[PDB]
Amino acid sequence: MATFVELSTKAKMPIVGLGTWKSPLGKVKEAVKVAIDAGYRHIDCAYVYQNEHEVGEAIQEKIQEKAVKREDLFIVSKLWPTFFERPLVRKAFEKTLKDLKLSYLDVYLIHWPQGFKSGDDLFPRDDKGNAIGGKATFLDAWEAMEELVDEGLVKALGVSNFSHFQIEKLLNKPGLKYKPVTNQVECHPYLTQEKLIQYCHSKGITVTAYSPLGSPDRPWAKPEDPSLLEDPKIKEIAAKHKKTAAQVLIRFHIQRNVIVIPKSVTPARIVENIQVFDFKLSDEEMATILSFNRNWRACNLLQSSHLEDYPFNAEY
Numbered sequence: 001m002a003t004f005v006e007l008s009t010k011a012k013m014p015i016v017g018l019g020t021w022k023s024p025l026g027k028v029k030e031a032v033k034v035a036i037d038a039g040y041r042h043i044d045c046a047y048v049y050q051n052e053h054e055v056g057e058a059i060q061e062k063i064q065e066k067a068v069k070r071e072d073l074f075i076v077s078k079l080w081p082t083f084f085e086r087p088l089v090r091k092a093f094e095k096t097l098k099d100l101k102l103s104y105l106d107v108y109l110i111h112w113p114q115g116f117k118s119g120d121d122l123f124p125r126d127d128k129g130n131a132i133g134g135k136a137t138f139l140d141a142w143e144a145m146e147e148l149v150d151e152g153l154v155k156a157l158g159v160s161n162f163s164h165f166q167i168e169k170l171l172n173k174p175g176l177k178y179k180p181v182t183n184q185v186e187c188h189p190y191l192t193q194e195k196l197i198q199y200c201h202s203k204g205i206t207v208t209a210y211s212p213l214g215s216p217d218r219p220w221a222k223p224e225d226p227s228l229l230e231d232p233k234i235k236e237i238a239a240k241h242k243k244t245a246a247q248v249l250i251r252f253h254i255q256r257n258v259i260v261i262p263k264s265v266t267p268a269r270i271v272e273n274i275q276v277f278d279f280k281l282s283d284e285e286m287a288t289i290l291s292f293n294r295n296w297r298a299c300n301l302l303q304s305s306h307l308e309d310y311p312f313n314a315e316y
């Protein structure tokens with residue numbers, strides 16, 4: 001049973017959620033069911049994961065068997081950047097909600113700030129594999145998303161992979177109806193996001209940490225790339241508490257009041273990843289962990305730097 005981070009809307013977002021990127025069909029349903037049993041109330045989803053239909057099946061199953069009430073679940077999905085054109089925003093959302101078998105989402109995020117070529121090719125790219133842009137912007141998309149909140153289909157809106165410049169562009173848009181309640185970005189001891197977190201918090205925006213374990217199963221991983229779970233200095237701290245490295249990496253975010261969404265389809269690990277409310281990292285331990293900041297991203301497979309609004313060039 002998790003503590004919470006309060007949003008600007010006063011809604012309570014569970015500080016630990018379940019990630020579902022690359023959760024396979026046939027394992028993700030069981031993953032969601034084990035997580036709800038273990039006390040997870042926050043599930044992080046996306047159109048682009050192409051598994052929301054199986055997540056929906058699992059959620060509905062657990063609501064049916066009285067394991068959990070809808071209003072105690074916090075469901076998040078994301079709009080993919082091939083759907084920034086107004087009518088596509090609605091159609092994309094409708095498929096997401098249809099797949100999830102829900103009547104509303106708790107938060108709906110812009111997945112990525114750069115617009116891609118519009119339509120149902122989710123990864124439009126040239127021969128060399130660089131992304132093909134579209135003319136619709138994240139501001140166009142936000143406009144259409146705000147309707148969903150007007151209609152009660154989404155409780156709050158958010159962003160993902162935005163630098164502070166792009167959040168400024170959003171916050172400083174004349175005639176804005178709803179503000180982002182969270183910015184979901186990569187965060188872990190090698191990418192501590194100190195400036196970005198400070199910025200978001202000062203604007204009443206929470207931060208959701210993705211890839212908190214360094215996404216160890218990412219396909220583009222080189223053995224030279226650092227590994228957090230195998231990091232001796234992380235493992236020292238885990239040992240001190242007789243906890244696992246994974247548990248330390250998750251607890252790190254909790255103690256910064258940052259929401260964190262570790263992904264697993266392994267029942268033992270799903271349970272392990274929420275056993276993080278019975279210990280506390282000392283100040284010196286937090287300081288030590290923060291010192292590991294390398295500014296290293298597990299997640300930037302996007303050959304999209306040539307397009308406008310690329311978020312990762314900025315200092316923060």
Ligand SMILES: NC(=O)c1ccc[n+]([C@@H]2O[C@H](COP(=O)([O-])OP(=O)(O)OC[C@H]3O[C@@H](n4cnc5c(N)ncnc54)[C@H](OP(=O)(O)O)[C@@H]3O)[C@@H](O)[C@H]2O)c1
Binds near residue numbers: 161212214216265273
């Ligand atoms: N907004 C975005 O752009 C964006 C981008 C990336 C991710 N996300 C979200 O954030 C979530 C989490 O990030 P991520 O999936 O990239 O990587 P991650 O959560 O850092 O790591 C997941 C990997 O670690 C393994 N694992 C999980 N718990 C473990 C434990 N206790 N001990 C050892 N290994 C463990 C998992 O294996 P098994 O699954 O085989 O157990 C999986 O291979 C995603 O699922 C997604 O919902 C969002």
Ligand SMILES: C/C(=C\c1ccc(C(=O)O)cc1Br)c1ccc2c(c1)C(C)(C)CCC2(C)C
Binds near residue numbers: 112130131132301
């Ligand atoms: C994999 C993907 C991005 C992506 C995937 C998952 C998540 C997430 O939230 O977990 C988040 C994200 Br963000 C992507 C985006 C653009 C492109 C590609 C993949 C490939 C590599 C297929 C070709 C080139 C382009 C640039 C079109």
